[PDB]
């Protein structure tokens, strides 16, 4: 009879080279490693958005609490946790008059209104950071709810995606401009109420999570790295391969794969893959031709050589579809004879639902289920001893992982992916289901394939999340 093996909780580093296990507690207790002075924030929107912006900005300075300190830790203050100052003054403000919106609302073409509102925000931002002397590091664009409830694709009176922030980031992408979207209902829920009499966007008790998420996003798009991971042997690359296909119908995509990688720190170098006219989606199981495969590998290895000067000893390929012989032989020749390459497939559609006999608790995070050397399981979600609660909904579901080709240890890739599912930046959560090389994959594909005019895209992370 076979049993379940366990993988220990991977540690993350903080200030002064010390290791912890909780991002919130570990980043409040010690702080960021590479410190910056701070950032100037600029807003574009109406005056109601500006006064909402200020109210929230001041609230974020003063400390806020929760109902317990076990699951959601308190917020001691932006300066107390990061070491950077945030104030009410020196905020660049660009306003928008309601007459333009009221006159332009009555067009039948919803996509035309989406496009011209997006270009209005775009060229206001472009002028604002191309005319004014005062520097702005993060642009907090605020949007009202009328454009969110009356200018939807299904409102009742193709390469550019219809959603707002997608094409906003894609259009601001080629001018090196970080920005962050702020829905007006997110930070002004005191008076934003429905007809029934209960705030549907309720934060009467979870203000701390908003503070943590906004502070972490603002500090990551500031320039400073919040945290890194613990153990990296010399010469290992976690090449997370994007498999985000875009949904354009008559424009032939046939492939929209990209790739991300983590080498020594939390920074990632995501290079745009090919437009990929190979193997039209009637055969869309993604068997990559040798030339695009060696192009992707050459960009990955060249960025590794540029940032670390040393040859990669081992290359890990994080994907979500099967690999075959011709693509493997294409991958093998360009990589040197000494190094080794291994590909893994992570999927969610595979079901396995373990239950627990007595009590009222789920299966705890860290256990692994091994069937063969080829295939194994890992419980990325479930109960966690640190938070004294769970992270899934009613039942956790594992991820089916299996090495496609190449010799390696299965528990090694188990702890490697368990370490990789900790580096989230947009959300200040303990952990999430898919690894961050795959969690960022959907968003990076979703913005980088939504703009066909970009040929030399940025290789950073701020201009996307």
């Amino acid at each position: 009879m076979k049993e379940l093996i366990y993988i220990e909780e991977p540690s993350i580093l903080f200030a002064h080279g010390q290791k912890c296990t909780d991002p919130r507690d570990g980043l409040a207790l010690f702080g960021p490693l590479n410190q910056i002075y701070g950032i100037k924030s600029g807003v574009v929107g109406t005056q109601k958005g500006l006064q909402i912006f200020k109210s929230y900005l001041d609230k974020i300075q003063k400390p806020i609490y929760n109902h317990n300190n076990i699951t959601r830790p308190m917020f001691p203050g932006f300066e107390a946790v990061f070491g950077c100052k945030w104030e009410s003054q020196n905020i660049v403000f660009k306003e928008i008059t309601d007459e333009e919106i009221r006159r332009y609302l009555f067009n039948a073409s919803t996509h035309k209104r989406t496009y011209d509102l997006v270009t209005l925000f775009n060229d206001k931002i472009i002028t604002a950071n191309k005319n004014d002397e005062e520097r702005v590091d993060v642009w907090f664009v605020i949007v009202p709810e009328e454009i969110y409830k009356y200018c939807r694709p299904n409102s009742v009176l193709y390469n550019y995606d219809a959603q707002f922030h997608d094409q906003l980031k894609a259009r601001l992408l080629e001018h090196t401009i970080p920005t962050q979207i702020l829905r007006e209902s997110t930070l002004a829920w005191r008076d934003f109420k429905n007809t029934f009499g209960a705030p549907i966007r309720d934060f009467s008790k979870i203000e701390g999570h908003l503070a943590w998420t906004i502070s972490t996003a603002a500090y990551y798009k500031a320039g400073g790295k919040p945290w890194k991971l613990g153990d990296i042997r010399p010469g290992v690359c976690y090449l997370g391969l994007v498999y985000k296909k875009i949904e354009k119908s008559k424009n032939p995509q046939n492939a929209c794969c990209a790739a991300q990688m983590f080498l020594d720190n939390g920074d990632g170098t995501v290079f745009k893959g090919e437009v990929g006219p190979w193997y039209n989606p009637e055969k869309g199981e993604y068997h990559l031709k040798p030339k695009e495969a060696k192009a992707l590998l050459t960009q990955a290895l060249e960025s590794y050589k540029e940032q670390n000067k040393s040859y990669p000893k081992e290359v890990f390929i994080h994907a979500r579809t099967r690999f075959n012989d011709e693509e493997w032989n294409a991958f093998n020749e360009v990589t040197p004879k000494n190094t080794n390459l291994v590909g893994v497939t992570i999927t969610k559609s595979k079901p396995l639902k373990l239950y627990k006999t007595e009590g009222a608790f789920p299966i705890m995070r860290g256990n692994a289920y091994i069937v063969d050397e080829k295939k194994a399981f890992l419980w990325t979600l479930g109960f966690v001893p640190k938070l004294q609660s769970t992270l899934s909904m009613e039942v956790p579901n594992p991820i089916f992982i299996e090495i496609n080709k190449g010799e390696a240890e299965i528990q090694q890739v188990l702890k490697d992916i368990l370490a990789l599912t900790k580096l989230n930046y947009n959300a200040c959560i303990y952990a999430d289901g898919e690894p961050v090389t795959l969690r960022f994959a959907n968003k990076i594909g979703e913005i980088l394939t939504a703009s066909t005019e970009i040929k030399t895209p940025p290789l950073a992370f701020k201009y996307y999340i």
Partner: protein, 450 residues
């Protein structure tokens, strides 16, 4: 000699700020003494407090919170601090702290009004800064900053009831292995006894067409009462293949490949189980890609089966539990049962829209936890099981499939500790974060609920 920093505060409402100050002070170099990290349960508290205050305490750190001015312990600590302050003759001994803007400066006691309290209200970073430089100008001895001791204290006291332990714990799946498998396949070469327009689902027993052949576990005498012209068929023309070679992966012939062998095996097991679950007289439902059933209200006795919950009503809506199956043979010869839930307004018909069903299912989901779902799964499996050890399938007139009614349990080496029942309401709050972070076109369908 005296070198210790003493913090008097109001536990447990002020535990977080005190933990912050104590950990950052011990990480910055200063040795601190507080009732959080030193005074644990089971020890005498006041004698140590007095001895540390009048023996090794260099400076006194009192907080002025809303509850930190009318409690007895903080007042007594302030009184003994005043006594030792008068003994040492040092007005730079008591350093008050204010952490609440709701507190007015005229409400604090008379021992706080004479000295200027250090602000910790609008921010804490410059509060730590102006507490730190005030220590140096008072020339208190300090040790070099080492955060290694802070990590040890954090792992020692703040990770005591929130870390994994070493005890065995058992867990059960939804997987039901195939205890007995048939010996031989049955391929039937008819070639003119089946019309081209024939649909193979109309048969009372499962079969699949294979290029000139009919594959099943049934016999040539099984198809008599609906195909009259199968009487002239001779059984010698049929071919048979042992299932041990198919299951062990050692069979690979030119006439049918091993992948195709296991594909027909799992597919024919799938519709055999579908026809058997149809034979149980259970009401149907039109699911998107699979075929799940649901038990009728009023059939099960007392709405109970071995004192368990399976079906009921919450808000004028009879909620009916159901399962779905899909065979699997890659890790083991096992059948997987999936969990599903659909509601009925009256108990006879269904709901005319799917959006209301999905929204109401997600509404009803959070009221119970995985223990109830386990009871539901085991209840439906043991109710469907005509046999008490397995489910009597219906694939032929003489040969059947035996699927066990109990799941394959998986036990782990080490697991968690068991806290109280507050965590279920905490997970309901976690569902409220799930509400509060993501939402998409929630207006029309919510307005269509009344």
């Amino acid at each position: 000699m005296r070198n210790k920093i003493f913090i008097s505060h109001a536990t447990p409402e002020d535990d977080d700020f005190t933990r912050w100050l104590s950990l950052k002070l011990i990480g910055l170099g200063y040795e601190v003494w507080c009732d959080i990290l030193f005074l644990d349960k089971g020890v005498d508290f006041w004698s140590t407090i007095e001895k540390e205050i009048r023996e090794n305490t260099c400076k006194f750190l009192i907080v002025s919170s809303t509850a930190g001015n009318k409690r007895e312990g903080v007042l007594k600590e302030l009184a003994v601090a005043t006594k030792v302050k008068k003994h040492l003759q040092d007005d730079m001994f008591i350093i008050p702290l204010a952490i609440d803007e709701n507190l007015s400066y005229d409400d604090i006691n008379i021992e706080i009004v004479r000295l200027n309290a250090i602000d910790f209200k609008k921010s804490w970073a410059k509060g730590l800064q102006d507490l730190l430089d005030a220590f140096e100008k008072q020339n208190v001895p300090k040790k070099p900053p080492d955060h290694s001791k802070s990590n040890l204290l954090y792992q020692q006291i703040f990770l005591h009831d929130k870390q994994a332990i070493e005890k065995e714990e058992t867990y059960d799946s939804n997987w039901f292995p195939i205890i007995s498998f048939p010996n031989e396949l049955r391929f039937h070469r008819y070639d003119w006894r089946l019309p081209k327009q024939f649909d193979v689902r109309t048969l009372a027993f499962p079969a699949i067409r294979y290029k000139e052949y009919l594959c099943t576990f049934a016999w040539e005498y099984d198809f008599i009462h609906q195909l009259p012209k199968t009487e002239t068929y001779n059984g010698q023309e049929s071919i048979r293949i042992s299932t041990s070679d198919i299951l062990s992966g050692r069979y690979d012939t030119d006439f049918i490949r091993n992948y195709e062998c296991q594909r027909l095996i799992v597919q024919l097991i799938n519709k055999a189980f579908e026809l058997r679950m149809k034979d149980k007289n259970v009401r149907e439902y039109q699911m998107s890609k699979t075929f799940a059933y649901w038990i009728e209200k009023g059939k099960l006795e007392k709405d109970k089966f071995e004192k368990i919950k399976l079906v009921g009503k919450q808000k004028n809506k009879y909620w009916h539990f159901g399962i779905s199956a899909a065979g699997k043979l890659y890790p083991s010869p096992v059948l997987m049962v999936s969990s599903h839930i659909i509601f009925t307004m009256d108990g006879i018909n269904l709901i005319k829209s799917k959006s209301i069903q999905h929204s109401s299912r997600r509404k009803q989901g959070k009221n119970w936890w995985n223990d109830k779902w386990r009871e539901k799964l085991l209840a439906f499996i043991r109710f469907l099981s005509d046999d008490q050890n397995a489910i009597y399938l219906n694939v032929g007139s003489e040969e059947k499939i035996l699927i066990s009614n109990k799941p394959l349990k998986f036990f782990g080496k080490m697991s968690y500790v068991t806290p109280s029942e507050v965590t279920l309401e905490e997970e309901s709050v976690l569902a409220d974060i799930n509400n509060f972070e993501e939402d998409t076109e929630d207006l029309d369908e919510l307005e269509d609920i009344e």
